[PDB]
Structure formats: structure tokens, C-alpha cells
């Protein structure tokens, strides 16, 4: 039925976008996950626990990505002044610059794939799947 | 912009559905990937190479899932009569029975998440994102 095919198509779209994004972001020395870590920290410091839960990846995966971004000088580990173990991952100026480039790549790709859709069509689909997202997130956790 | 948010929302939906599906399929002793292997072989034998490429997972991931399903008696490795190394993964009767149960779980979940959408709305969204899928697959590979 249709409700099943919408979710199944959403899944296939994600897999294909994941493959292509890892490919295009590769030129910025980033993996798709690395880019997500930058997107997440672009608007404020994030705990490593949040990163893992928000993007449904393992803790080691996040540790791996954070260490890499840190070595690359795109993020820094900030510790509380009184409790140095309270860690937050903060994006650096360089990190923001790279993130913005990642965004332009993401933007370009998005325009290509949604090419057969008009502005209004894009609008209709967006407003509706946002309902789906709201529900699954209420259900999943 | 909107074209960016459609792909980003599609991604979040997929992550949330992945988490919930692994949870619900867990009762059938299956992981989300295991279920995909069953879905893929439900309509005909598939090469392990195809499974890995179609669902964008590593070769070891597929090997792991196939061995598990094989132990569970849900799939079998069929070899060519003249070249025993030519392998195809064929679903078993038991595998089909389990797959069908997985489908009902998937179906139930899909109805819940798309609950705020009417039949027509589901239709509109489906016909449009199918265009997106067609393009990304043309682009990604
Ligand atoms: Ca809840
Ligand atoms: Ca091509």
C-alpha cells in the first residue's frame, strides 16, 4: 500500500543521498557523519551523548568523528571551569568555514535531486513529511 | 531553503524509523538489515554483491546478516550446478513466513507515523518523492 511505499522510498532516498554526500563531502576531507557533527555544533556546543543519540550512531562513532574533526582543527572540546570532565564539543571558526562549504555542496545536490519538482510541489511535500517526522520521533523515543 | 529541508527531513525520518524498526523487528529475532535481506530475496534469489550495493552496506555486513539468516533457517545459499562458487541467496518458506510478519510490523508502523495524513495527501507526497528518488539514484551511481 501507499503508506508503506512512502517510508520505503524515504529510506532509499536516504541511502542514495548518503552515498553521494560522502562522495562530494570527501573533497572537504569530511565523511557524512563528520558533516553532521559540524551541522549540530554550528549553532551551539553539543555533548557527545547528544550527537550520538540525535544522529542514531554509536558512541565510538562519535568519538572517532570528534577526534578527527579536532585533529583537523574544526572543533574543540570545552570543559567546565569547575568540573573539567563536563565536556561540550564547540565548533571553531575554521570549522564554521568548512561547514558552510559543506552546506553549499548539500544545497547544490538538493537542488539537483528535487529538480523535477516546482517550488509549490517542494512546499507541499515538505509541510506534509514534517508531520511524519513529528510522529516517528514521538514514537521512536 | 526548502529543497534543503526536504532532504534533511527525509534523513531524520529515516534515522527515527531505523531505530524503531530495529526495536519492533527485534521480536522476530531480526535487525533492520536482516529484514531488508529478506525483503530483497522475497521476490527472487539475490547475489551478495547486489544486497550490499542496493542497501549501501559493507560486504562484511551482508556476510554477517546472511550467515545469521542461514543459521535461522530463513535463507539458503544456492550454488550453480557447474560452478559451485556462483552463489545466490534464496529465501526459504520459513523465511517468507517471517518476512510477511516483518511486513505487517512495517505496515503497522507506517500507518501510525503517516497518521496525520489523509489518503490523498499520502498519494501526493508519494508521487513526488518518487521523482527525487529517481534522480538521486541516477546521480549517486
Ligand atoms: Ca514517546
Ligand atoms: Ca549515472
UniProtKB/TrEMBL annotation, chains A, B:
Segments forming domain HTH marR-type: 3-134
User: Mind telling me which Gene3D superfamilies this protein's record contains?
Assistant: Winged helix-like DNA-binding domain superfamily/Winged helix DNA-binding domain
Q: GO terms for molecular function, please?
A: DNA-binding transcription factor activity; metal ion binding
Positions bound to Zn(2+): 80, 82
Task: List the GO biological process terms.
Answer: response to stress
Per UniProt, which keywords does this protein have? Calcium, Metal-binding, Zinc
The entry's Ca(2+) 2-binding residues are 138, 141
Instruction: Spell out the InterPro entries in the cross-references.
Output: HTH_MarR-typ (IPR000835), MarR/SlyA-like (IPR039422), WH-like_DNA-bd_sf (IPR036388), WH_DNA-bd_sf (IPR036390)
Residues bound to Ca(2+) 1:
138
| Pfam families on file | MarR_2
Name-wise, this protein is MarR family transcriptional regulator
